[PDB]
Amino acid sequence: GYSDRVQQITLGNSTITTQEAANAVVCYAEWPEYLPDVDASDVNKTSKPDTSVCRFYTLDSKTWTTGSKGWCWKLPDALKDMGVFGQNMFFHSLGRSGYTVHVQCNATKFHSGCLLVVVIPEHQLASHEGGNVSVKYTFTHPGERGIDLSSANEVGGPVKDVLYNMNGTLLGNLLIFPHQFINLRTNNTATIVIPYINSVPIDSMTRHNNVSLMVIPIAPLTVPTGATPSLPITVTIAPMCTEFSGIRSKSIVPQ
Amino acid sequence: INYYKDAASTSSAGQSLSMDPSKFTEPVKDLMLKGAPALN
Amino acid sequence: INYYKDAASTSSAGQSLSMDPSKFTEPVKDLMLKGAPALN
Amino acid sequence: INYYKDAASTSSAGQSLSMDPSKFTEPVKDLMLKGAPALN
Amino acid sequence: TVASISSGPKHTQKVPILTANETGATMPVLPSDSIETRTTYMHFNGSETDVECFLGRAACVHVTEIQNKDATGIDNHREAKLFNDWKINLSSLVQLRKKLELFTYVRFDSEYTILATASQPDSANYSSNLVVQAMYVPPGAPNPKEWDDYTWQSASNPSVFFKVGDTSRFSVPYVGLASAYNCFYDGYSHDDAETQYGITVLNHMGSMAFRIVNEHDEHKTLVKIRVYHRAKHVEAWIPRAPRALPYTSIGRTNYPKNTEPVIKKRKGDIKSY
Amino acid sequence: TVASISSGPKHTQKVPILTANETGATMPVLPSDSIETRTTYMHFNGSETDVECFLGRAACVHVTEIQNKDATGIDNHREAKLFNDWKINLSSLVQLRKKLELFTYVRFDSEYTILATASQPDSANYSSNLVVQAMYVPPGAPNPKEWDDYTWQSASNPSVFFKVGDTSRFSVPYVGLASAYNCFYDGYSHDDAETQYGITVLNHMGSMAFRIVNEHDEHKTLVKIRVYHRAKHVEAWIPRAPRALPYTSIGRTNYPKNTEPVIKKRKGDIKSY
Amino acid sequence: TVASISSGPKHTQKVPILTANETGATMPVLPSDSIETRTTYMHFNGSETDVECFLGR
Amino acid sequence: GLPTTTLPGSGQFLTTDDRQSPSALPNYEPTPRIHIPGKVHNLLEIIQVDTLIPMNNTHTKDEVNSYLIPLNANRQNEQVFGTNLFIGDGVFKTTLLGEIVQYYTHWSGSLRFSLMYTGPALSSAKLILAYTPPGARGPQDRREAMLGTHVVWDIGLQSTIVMTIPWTSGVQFRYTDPDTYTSAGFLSCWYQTSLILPPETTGQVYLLSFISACPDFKLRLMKDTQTISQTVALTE
Amino acid sequence: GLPTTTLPGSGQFLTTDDRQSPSALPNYEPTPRIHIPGKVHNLLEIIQVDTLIPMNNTH
Amino acid sequence: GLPTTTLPGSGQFLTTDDRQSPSALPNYEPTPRIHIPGKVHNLLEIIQVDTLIPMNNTH
Ligand SMILES: CCOC(=O)c1csc(N2CCN(C3=Nc4ccccc4SC3)CC2)n1
């Protein structure tokens, strides 16, 4: 009586149940694991807070309306302030982590709408100015708020044009990245497990984000007659196999 | 025959002949069998 | 000795030394023996 | 393959892979053990 | 290898063509799951689509130019073409760039090839024969200042001398600082409020000072340098969506404003053929 | 091997020399069936009549020309010889063409050879040294537009750079779409009422853009390109009647009107020697 | 080859970090004598610092 | 001294040749490789992942909406969409498949075309997808369409339908740049019965459509893509 | 570096010589051969088929 | 005479390449080596000897 459909994920002191899942994706078919010695470089023993950092943090909720263009969060940024995960983050020189991402959106059998939930490794954004204008730090570190693709261009911020993925590629091809759809008629959640993907064994958690999670409405939300025209979307994310190394004074970052 | 000492100096590599699209085409956690229902 | 990897890059082929004109000179359905009458 | 008769004409030598800094880093007459007191 | 097996009529409870794309998988459906097929063999290996093959041919990565002329009274050799540099990068001419950016991280040895041809746009009695000297000059080393500085001694820095009209060829090991040259980088060099973004922060590979070794003749000679790059021993990770809009800058993802629709509009209906 | 066996007088009921040609056969009659012969050996193998040998020597297949000159103010490089193409085909110079069309289908690898020589028809101080860059550009790829377009980057398209006066040589695998390059084709590309006919429909192989890499000197230089083609690994099927009338067009069988009698008229009678 | 071995807390009478430089030696102290380390390998031979290489171009 | 002769081609530079060269950095030791998920070995590995087709191409500036094929409730017998199958051009051209095919001159193989339905769960519909092999015109009505390769799709719990365009061809390779002789057919879709929405519901519903290549597929003779060009070198 | 000497004829192009060359299309896979009746191997095979002689040349 | 083809790079001088050369002094006998204390093999040997740092740079 197991269905692909019902699932339970327990991680730390927190549990999620979905009764309307559509399997789960594990990026590149690899599950998060700690850093092996053969791959290690820094000689420091690392710190593995385990259950105090590897639990589920639910970010603040978004509201899908008929005019929504899509939202974008960066990792580990989105979690920069969650509990002890965040403290560890500002206090060590280097850290590394994988995540379980669970995006939630329920409706009824009269609604229609379909969101794309995708994880993009190394999502370098484009400046809407063109040329070689850079995208300032603050703009690519929105924190739990994430970036709202239907917000206005700002100065020093990225471009927010959806048919171009914020980088000069077409929305249609985002499907080459680990992703899952939430089609109100099928699905009510999306779950993706992200292994740590980098060109170095461990890195800085503040100067470099290693994935952007993106939720994009593709088939517009259509509510039943005289229904309220909107649904909330909630994102809950859990660091998994986290390791921190090179402890010290506590980083100070712009803004 | 390599005439040179360093590995960078050798010619192109030879075909992976690796080929396994499943990391890209089927990264699902619970295995899906073709023919069985997608969602049970 | 081939110095190159691809087959197109090798020199000319070597003599068929095949040679069988009968597909062209005697494509008849019932075999004709020289010396026997052509039409019986 | 050396094409030439004299040794000076051969290519560069190949890595010492000798490496022993102690003549430079520890030329002391009575041996010092790390962890034991420097001056007894 | 069979490309298609033989398959006949079906009347089952087992439907391989109905799936749920919401899952993120592309189910491996074949012609024989939905029509009746006959056996056929592949006759093919997929040799020429190997990434080593795809990135393994020489591509032009840079065209520069230097001139041989009397430097007498030139206050700025660099500025007169008495010599020129090249802040090594691979993303300045777009053909090879789009190919590499199909991947996120890439690792390979480089083989370069350098063609130099001369031009004599104004009245010369003859064509002189010039020797070029391209110096690999890495980050933290003396930047040549004049076309005949002590720098050109290049006692510790690899340099090649070849003749204009000829070609020079050498290959450089993989020299990225990490395990793989990074194609994209969503980071900064530090948490500064105004530091740049992208990859121009990461991969630093250093210049390449080119100069003519010859002193000047009576006429002037323009030498134009073309650098070709071939990846050998390629390794690529994490495929990405291909580049759709035009490029504006070496190392940022930025596209031009008021660009044009990249998807061709139908001449007719959705229903049109 | 015997070329003739010994044979003596005959008085038989078995007549090998009477046949019925209406049958379509050529009965294998020999000297020894009708005169008295002596033994003789062949001393010969027929080596130099092998089709690999017959089609295996280089033949000139194309002569084109490009010039190096100041492109300043040229509105159409292609039109000024700043560069030129070659819609690859083999049936434009007739010598090799008649040889190939002795067969209906032919399959082979090609080895090309490209000779480039320069001419300076009007007053020059000297002969410059130019590098040619012939780009293989296949159907569906950017057509070069100027002599120095992004196209010439040729990051994915094989190109060779050689010097004028020298020769370039490379060989291309067999690249026909079918199992054998077609010599004749009695068809159309589709059942259209006005579509063309012949082979120009089938075998498409793409251009070859040639250009000089050098910028301009003070004089102008004419470079004339000759492409030679040698078949290697030849396979030929279905012999046909040799070409009798002159050719008029690359890919059609058409002969010129009011052509001249191709059979030599006797100077004398049927009875004449 | 290991570049660093794994080493944990220490509370000893055996102090490798106190020395007397007046002796002329450079005592071979390592990260693992004064912090807690994890194993890591060298992955490197020191090929390009050989004097033949240094004076050989 | 051993006697030699040099052949035609000496000194040429062929961008596609593969030989040894001296290393400029003798004895240098590259950084160790660490493990990174996601390694690609063949472009054939990636063109089997499906991506969305902007089928609804009828707009005037690129929009998320050209990915949506609309469906109308209560229409009978009628046609949902049509397209030829020049995978190197037109709708296909910006898709990952289209985009890679363009790096090669010839392609052969089967294509997989699937449609995922996004209408309310309490609605229902039956569509027919038809592949018309080369030689006939794009079908003009379902009767015409239904006589060629087709699948009646019944919209249900299982949200997507995967249609395969089996390789139907005389010649074993086709050109990726559109060519007549070498052309591959048409793909059309019609109401089999009709879309029906539940009460309290209204308007258009959309289908998303994807394209990917079957394991069948072959691509050969690499060349340059018409999809990217430039007028001056970029700088930093 | 192995010592060599080049002979007279170096650099010449003889249309009849038969040597190896680099392939411009590294790794390309040609179309499979299928069977076709009629293969010719030697011109000696075909000159044994008889054909008509315009003997009456007098026109 | 063995057929050859020369590749791109022929005739170049790369200051970092390592090949054989003819000896100008054929048959000459170098002076014997005697023993000298202090041989260095790697620069890695010497950077492990400590030296003083002008830390007080303020002059
Ligand atoms: C699409 C964006 O990616 C890039 O631009 C990119 C990715 S790797 C790359 N390299 C790394 C290899 N290299 C190098 N050449 C040299 C040439 C001459 C002399 C010394 C070197 S030492 C490294 C060229 C630039 N650049």
Ligand SMILES: CCOC(=O)c1csc(N2CCN(C3=Nc4ccccc4SC3)CC2)n1
């Ligand atoms: C008598 C009528 O038959 C013909 O004209 C005929 C029959 S086969 C034939 N080829 C097939 C082989 N080829 C080719 N060369 C190239 C040259 C340079 C670069 C790429 C190629 S890719 C194919 C030349 C034309 N043409």
